[PDB]
Each structure stands twice: as structure tokens, then as C-alpha cells.
Symmetry: D2
Subunit: 245 residues, 4 copies
């Protein structure tokens, strides 16, 4: 129980990497505030974790809503007494060419992956400053490598990375650790949201013949980074499927 | 001599700084120029100046953050000038300050202009550039390559422009659309005037006062070099820094 | 005992990060082949590890010596059964300006940090292919970020990173995992070897206010990467002192 | 006549990019010192350049040879008055897998692409400081992008880039401009030297369909960078074939 007495807030906790991360942190003894739009999914996860002995705080939240973000951080601190770890995991991946793109793909991705992550970082920061806490940014291979049909997705993830390095420069001397996780292909619900049909199909075929990373693997990376001693900031973990060039 | 005789260039953020100098430089090469920004009075004055020297000019009152405005500005340009050969996505704002307790309207403004605006204008011009085997020039920054304190969101937008633009290159380069990314360091423009975080504005102005700054004309020459390169050559990145600045 | 039955070869095991990594891998049940130029220190470590229950194979080796490298890989396979993990940790950091540099600084760094690492990678590769093994490259923050007075050091580490990314592209499909660890300032013998006296003094001063990373912290990064499931390649871990902008 | 009265030293001037660069700089009014191993090609170029109105100094030089490098710099200042522009263009590209690689490929590449470039940079530096001159580093797409079967070539070019960024930090304030040119596929003699036959055939097929960059295009990039006003350092120009993803 490396995180006994600590409080973690995890966005995008209703499925995928966020769900596995909530579980992994709870297993380490952290109280978990789990946030997402699908209230029912969170309550189900919340019940499971509570039944296993965890302290859970359920938050219905859209990370793109600045005021909503402020209230979620406030609610977490009221219910759980503080904030030691923030996991900015809420995100969406809408693939397709730039040409003739559905620009709501773009505004959604920017709102959630970039602005939402920034809003939640800023709202949590005074609390993380007090606790000399850790912010974990869920980036991507797409924050490191550019491939076709992911231009705006990659823009947001390279943006998260730059935002996060700069944030590290700003707050690291005050003991706030900035951790950036960069998974490659992970078996989640992420790809089901792709709106460009031809691209959804190409992407599905591209990832069909690898062993994908598991959400649990990414959760383990988070666990490794957050349980490191305070004097160490694991600023980047870049984890790739072994099967994938 | 006129390396760009007969070509049509659309330059966003043309009312001052790098965009103004770029519009002038391209006009001097014989390009017809569509000049876009929000301060129409500035644009008209530039248009008049350019027209007086024998240039063909189309004035566009435009906010790049306005998706509908963008489509209309591209349509207006192709109708007035015949087509589109070069797009220069130069409109942008740099609002420095710490992340902690930031005025988040700094952020939404930078994302709307620097990132979404540039993407909207890229997307709108692209069918025309495909037809002309044209060139899109993205005005990034040293901030797209190097992270310094108090520029978190600005740097996010510029690293974003770079990733968007490399991906775009992969998608369109085989069809003959060249993607050029220009990355200036400190350049003597109006940019710094807009910083809203007072302490940071003063820190920034103090830092840059100690160096010979890049000139807007220097960045215009970089654009000129990239766009006049033979079609088979894509000058994908030009990173130009003040010599005086580590 | 995650590595029971596995064989690891660690270069630069006589002190610093290599010593701590050898210790950490042995503690997980790995047989360890320990390689360096100071046999007296290697023997003293080997004595301890065998005392704790590890099988140890001592290698007197200069990584710059191509034939020495081939021979060290061969005697390890004969002695320990095979090769599962390679840790290319041997390195030197000779800081100074480029202007009037002692160019023997440069040849030493290139021979050890770059060429030596490449030689050992090539020599181990057949055995790593057969075992679906892992190669861990000890890079640096100097492979990610450039600072003054470290030009050739940074050249070698950026070089290590490129070489290793390319290597991953070449061998990952056959199950050879390529891991790159990038430590910031770590409290080891490394800084003692700087031959430019004025730069040594400046560097010591630059790092004097922070809590440095410890060799054991970097060993833990290695342990985490190598104990990850086979389908996961932790290609990069960038670990920085929290105190250091 | 933008470079009238200036002195340029170009390494690898006997063919390819270096030959075109010498021609371009001479055309702008520079006195040119042209360095390579094939003296008979150099003398033939020197005659053309002299016939065109340029002052030429011919240097037989192996850039891997430190002594020879120091003598070439001295010879040039004696013959031509000083040194204003250095073009470190000498290079070789030896492609092939890392696995079972002919390691002489590696040592040749490091000696020439990395060490020789560093040697020449260091030797020229005193003179460039006095003249507030420009050093131009001939890197590659291989210093920005990693592809298969180019591991060690990429290591050298990423190394050049790190070295050169650091060099810039060390010398920029004293008026020495550091310019890095990064060409993609260019139609030169480079690919003829590949020793791994299978890779040579794959590479030549790979580039068989595109309009390649021309040596003259790269010379123009150099011309643009060095004729920029002194307050501007064109630190990187990354120039790719339009036809090539
Ligand atoms: N799977 C993969 O291959 C990779 C994923 N990633 C990153 O992992 C992160 C999580 O995605 P992943 O688990 O894969 O996919 P999932 O779709 O399974 O998870 C995304 C989570 O984010 C939540 N979410 C989406 N939008 C919002 C919003 N606006 N406000 C609050 N919550 C939101 C979703 O829940 P809800 O709808 O209930 O709000 C869901 O819980 C993303 O940042 C993604 O970019 C990175 C690299 C690889
Ligand atoms: N100056 C510097 O040190 C550097 C600048 N840059 C980049 O150069 C580009 C131009 O800035 P620069 O010349 O320096 O500074 P300026 O402020 O002088 O120019 C910015 C231009 O963009 C226009 N603009 C701003 N927002 C919008 C918008 N919403 N819609 C349409 N036009 C807009 C402005 O005119 P108007 O108000 O009339 O609309 C102005 O013409 C920016 O992208 C900036 O990031 C990059 C690196 C360094
Ligand atoms: N300490 C730090 O702040 C950082 C270190 N690193 C990297 O970690 C690695 C280890 O350095 P560190 O532990 O810090 O310092 P140490 O000096 O304590 O360790 C270096 C090890 O390498 C060995 N070595 C040196 N040259 C050779 C050679 N030619 N052949 C075989 N072994 C050799 C030394 O042993 P022996 O003399 O017996 O051969 C020693 O065991 C290096 O690659 C370094 O670049 C990376 C980032 C930060
Ligand atoms: N062609 C391409 O697709 C690209 C090339 N490059 C770079 O451009 C540079 C020039 O190569 P390129 O023109 O293409 O090919 P070439 O082979 O035509 O030119 C290489 C030049 O380097 C010289 N040279 C090689 N070794 C040495 C040495 N040991 N000492 C002194 N001179 C030497 C050769 O002359 P000699 O034999 O007479 O000594 C020759 O003149 C290289 O650094 C290469 O990495 C970068 C990107 C793309």
C-alpha cells in the first residue's frame, strides 16, 4: 500500500486506461475520485472499488467545461480531504484526413485533449502545490510520432507534451511532479469513436495483427511513476507494443 | 525580377509584423496578394501602398477563428484573383504568463487563433492548393521547437501547428502540395504588446531588449526562399534564431 | 523473482548506476554477468551477489575493444546458459567547451558511449533474438536536452537514442525489446572524470543545490522496464531530479 | 557579390553537394578553399572556379585525420587571409542492418561524419570568432527522422545536430553563426558507397520513382543561410523531396 492516505483524481475513469488506473491506485491504498460523463459507468466502478475496501468519490464531469472543472476539484477536496495525484486521462481520438474534415472532430479533440487537460491542471495546481503532489498527463505515441490521418489528434498530444514540459519548469522547484505517459496502441474503447468511416476501417486493420498494450499495462506505468520517491520526477514513459514497428 | 509572376498568395495576419512584410515581399515577386486580418484600416493602408506600386491586391477583413469567415475569405480570394497558389498562415497571438492562476481567456484566444484558425484556413485553401500544386506556409515559432517558462499554452499551440503540419505534409505531398513551416525566434513586431500578464510582459521585454532582434523582413525572406524553391523541393522547416540569443 | 532463470549482462557494473542495476536484477533472480575495467571492484560486488544467492560471472572488459566485446558475450553464454537482458551502461562524461578541446576527450566518449554500446548490441543480438530478450540502453537527459559545455557528450547520447530507435524498428517484430533509460543528475562517480578543470568546477556548482537522483532510482527504472510483460516495450523512461529545472 | 572578400572552406568538395556549394559560394564572390581526398577532381573544380573569377585554394584532406585538419585550416589562412565560412560537408552513408553488420561501416561513418566534422569545427573556430563567421553543418533528414537499415548513419547525424546546437549555445553570443542543413534524398555519389548489397538495392528501388533533390538545391539553401544578415542565424533548414512521404 504505497499510496495509503493519498488522494487521486482520475479523469476519463469510466472506461479504458482511466478505469484500470483508478483500480491500480485504489489497490495501492489511495482514495480515488473518479470522473467522466457516463455517470452510470462510474457508479458501477465506484461500487466495485468500494466493495473491495476503497474510498471512492464519484464525479459527473465534462473536462471541457471550465466551471465544471473547478467544481469537480472543489468536490474532491471536500469529500476526500485533499489532492495528491491528478491523472488527466480524459481524451478522444477522431482520425481522418485534414482534407474535407468534419471540423467538429477538431473542436471536440481540442476541447477535451488539450483545453480540458489544461483547465484540470490549473484547477488542481493550488492543491498539488500544498501536498507536493503529482500530475500525470495521459499523452500518446501521437505526442512523439506523426502518422497519416491523425493530424489534429497529434497536434493535441504534441501540445499536451509541450504544455507539460513547460509546466514542469514552472512548478517542479515547488515539489509538484509532472509525469507524462505516452502509450502506443492500447486495447480500449478509444477507436470506436472515430467518425471518418474509411479511416476507422484502415486503423482497425492496421492494429489487427499485434498484441496490443493492455489498459493494465498503462496503469502499471502510472503506478511506477507516482510511487517513485519525491526527489524523482519520471517525466516521460514511452511505452510501445513490442509487435509494432 | 518576378519569381512569382501570375501566382496568388493569401496571407493571414497581414496588418502588421511578419505578415505585412511577407505580403510586401510576395507582391514584389509579382504575386497577386490577398491580405487578411481584423484591423481593416491597416489592411486598406497596406493595400493602397501595394496597389500604388503596381501590385494586385484583395483586402479581407477576417478573424481566422471564425470558421465561416475563413470559408468566405478563401471563396472571395479565388473569385477576385483567379485561384490560390500560396497560403501563409501567419495570424497569431502570444500571451505569456504562468499556468498557475492564469487568465484562461489567454488560452482560448491562443488556441482559437494559433491552432484552430490555422487549421480552418489550411482546410479551406486545400482544395485550391491541390489544383494549383501550391504551397502552404505555416508560421510556427521557436516556441514550436523549444519550451521556456511562462509560455506553456503558446508553446502547446506551436508544437501543435508543427505536428499538424508534418502530418499534413505526409497526406498531401504526393499530390504536389508543399508544406513549409517557418520557425522564427524573437522578431521585432507588435506581438509582445498583447501579453496580459503584467509581470511576465515586463520580464519578456527586459530579456529581449538585450539582443539584436530578427526583423519582420528577415522572416519574409525566409518565406520567399521557401516558396521560390523548385516544385520538387519542399523546404519543410526553416528555424531562424537571433544570433545574439542563446 | 520475476527474472528467475533469466541471464543479464550489465556493462559499467563496477560503480554507479551499473552497480545498482546489477544488484536490482540479481534481487529479482537474474543470473548476472558483470562487466567493467576495474576487476577489484567487480570481484567485491560479485562476492556480495553470490553471497546473497545470485550466480555471478565476472567480465574484465573495455567496451571499446571489439574483440573483447565478442569474447565477453561468448564466455557469458558458456558460463550462464544464454542471454536474456543486456544493459549497455558503460559510459563517461567529459565536459568542456568545444573551443580548444582535448580531442582525446571526444575519442574516449565516442569509443565508450557510442561505439562500445553499438559493439555490445551487435554481439548480444543473436542471443537476444533466440531468447526474445531485452536490450537496455543507458542514455541520459543529454540525449534529450542540450546544455552548454556538453557538446560531444550530447552528440554521443543523441546518437545512442537514434541508433536505438532504429534498432527497435529492425528487431522489435522478432521480439527483441529495446529500452532506453534517460536519467538526469544522478549521484555517481561520473563527474569525477571531467578533464576540463574549469568545467568540472562549474558543473559541481550547478548541481550542488538539488536532491540528486540515486543509482538505486535508475536501477528501479530498469527493473520496471525489464519486468514489463513481453508485449510491452518501455522504449523510453526520462527521469529527472524534481528539484532541477 | 554578397560574399565579396569573404573566405569559405568547403569539405567534401570533390563531388555532390560540396561541389555545388563551392560553386555557389564562389559565384557570390567568396574565395574558396576546397577540401577532399580525390585531388584530381578538386583540381578540375579549382580550374573551373578560377576560370570563373574566383580565388581557389586546393586542400588534399582526410577529415578523419586531426593533424591533416589542423594543417588544412592553417594552409587556408596563409593562402586566403582568414576564414569567414566553414562548410562541413564531407560525409559517407553506409546502410545496412545492425544485425551481423560489417563494423568497419560504423567506424568509417563515425570518423568522417562525426569526429571529422568536430575536428574541423574546432580547428576553424579561432578564425571564425575573429571574423564573426558562419559554420555550416551538413546534416541530413537522418538527423531528424529514423528509418530502418540506417541506424549508425542516423546516430552520426543526430550527433552532428546535438553537437551543433550546443556549439551554437557556446559561440553564438560572440558572433559565430551555426547553420545546420538537413537534406532529404539528393542525386549525388553518396549511395554508390553502400557496402551492404541487399540494402543498397532496396534503397535504390525506394528512391527510383521520386524527383530527387539536386545538389544545386542544397547549395542554394547554404547560400540563403550564409547571406542572411549577421543578426540572423538560420539554424536549421530541413529540405525534403516533395514526392517523398
Ligand atoms: N487506447 C489507445 O490506443 C491510446 C489511448 N491514449 C489516451 O488514453 C486516454 C484515455 O483513452 P482510452 O482509455 O484509450 O479510451 P476510452 O474511450 O476507453 O477512455 C476515454 C475516457 O475519457 C472519458 N471522456 C471522454 N471525453 C470526456 C470529457 N469531455 N470529459 C470527461 N471525460 C471524458 C470517457 O468517458 P465518458 O464518455 O464517460 O466521459 C472515457 O472514460 C486518452 O487521453 C487517449 O488519447 C493514448 C495512447 C494510446
Ligand atoms: N514576433 C516574434 O518574436 C515571433 C512571432 N511569431 C509568429 O509570427 C506570427 C505573426 O505575429 P507577429 O508579426 O510577430 O506579431 P503581430 O502582432 O505584429 O502580427 C500578428 C498579426 O496577426 C493578426 N491577427 C491576430 N489575431 C488574429 C485573428 N484572430 N484573425 C486574423 N488576424 C489576426 C494581427 O492583426 P489584426 O489585429 O488586425 O487582426 C497581426 O496582423 C504569429 O503567428 C506569431 O506567433 C513566431 C516566432 C517569433
Ligand atoms: N551520473 C549521472 O548524472 C548520469 C549518468 N548517466 C549515464 O549512466 C552511465 C553510467 O554512469 P554513472 O554510473 O553515472 O558513472 P560511473 O562512473 O559511476 O559509472 C560508469 C561505469 O562505466 C564503466 N566504464 C567506463 N568506461 C568503460 C569502458 N571503456 N569499458 C567498460 N566499462 C567502462 C566504469 O567502470 P570501470 O572504470 O571499472 O570500467 C563504471 O563502472 C553512463 O552511460 C552515463 O552516461 C546518464 C545520465 C546521468
Ligand atoms: N545525397 C543525399 O541523399 C544526402 C546527403 N547528405 C549529406 O551530404 C553530404 C555530402 O554527400 P553527397 O554530396 O550526397 O555525396 P558525395 O559522395 O557525392 O559527396 C561526399 C563528399 O565527401 C567527401 N569525403 C568523404 N569522406 C571524406 C573524408 N574522409 N575526408 C574528406 N572528404 C571526404 C567525398 O570526396 P572524396 O572521396 O574525394 O574525399 C565527396 O566529395 C554528406 O555529409 C551526406 O551525409 C545529407 C542528406 C541527403
Amino acid at each position: 500500500s504505497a499510496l495509503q492516505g493519498k488522494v487521486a483524481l482520475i479523469t476519463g475513469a469510466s472506461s479504458g486506461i482511466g478505469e484500470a488506473t483508478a483500480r491500480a491506485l485504489a489497490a495501492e491504498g489511495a482514495a480515488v475520485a473518479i470522473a467522466a460523463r457516463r455517470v452510470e459507468k462510474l457508479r458501477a466502478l465506484g461500487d466495485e472499488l468500494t466493495a473491495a475496501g476503497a474510498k471512492v468519490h464519484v464525479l459527473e464531469l465534462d473536462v471541457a467545461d471550465r466551471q465544471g472543472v473547478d467544481a469537480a476539484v472543489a468536490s474532491t477536496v471536500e469529500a476526500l480531504g485533499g489532492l495528491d495525484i491528478l491523472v488527466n486521462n480524459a481524451g478522444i481520438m477522431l482520425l481522418g484526413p485534414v482534407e474535407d474534415a468534419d471540423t467538429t472532430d477538431w473542436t471536440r479533440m481540442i476541447d477535451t485533449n488539450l483545453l480540458g487537460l489544461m483547465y484540470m491542471t490549473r484547477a488542481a495546481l493550488p492543491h498539488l502545490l500544498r501536498s507536493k503532489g503529482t500530475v500525470v498527463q495521459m499523452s500518446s505515441i501521437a505526442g512523439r510520432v506523426n502518422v497519416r490521418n491523425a493530424a489534429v489528434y497529434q497536434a493535441t498530444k504534441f501540445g499536451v507534451n509541450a504544455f507539460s514540459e513547460t509546466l514542469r519548469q514552472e512548478v517542479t522547484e515547488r515539489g509538484v511532479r509532472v509525469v507524462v505517459i505516452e502509450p502506443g496502441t492500447t486495447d480500449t474503447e478509444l477507436r470506436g469513436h472515430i467518425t471518418h468511416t474509411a479511416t476507422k476501417e484502415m486503423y482497425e486493420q492496421r492494429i489487427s495483427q499485434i498484441r496490443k498494450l493492455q489498459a493494465q499495462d498503462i496503469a502499471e506505468a502510472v503506478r511506477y511513476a507516482v510511487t517513485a520517491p519525491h526527489h524523482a520526477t519520471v517525466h516521460e514513459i514511452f511505452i510501445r507494443p513490442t509487435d509494432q514497428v
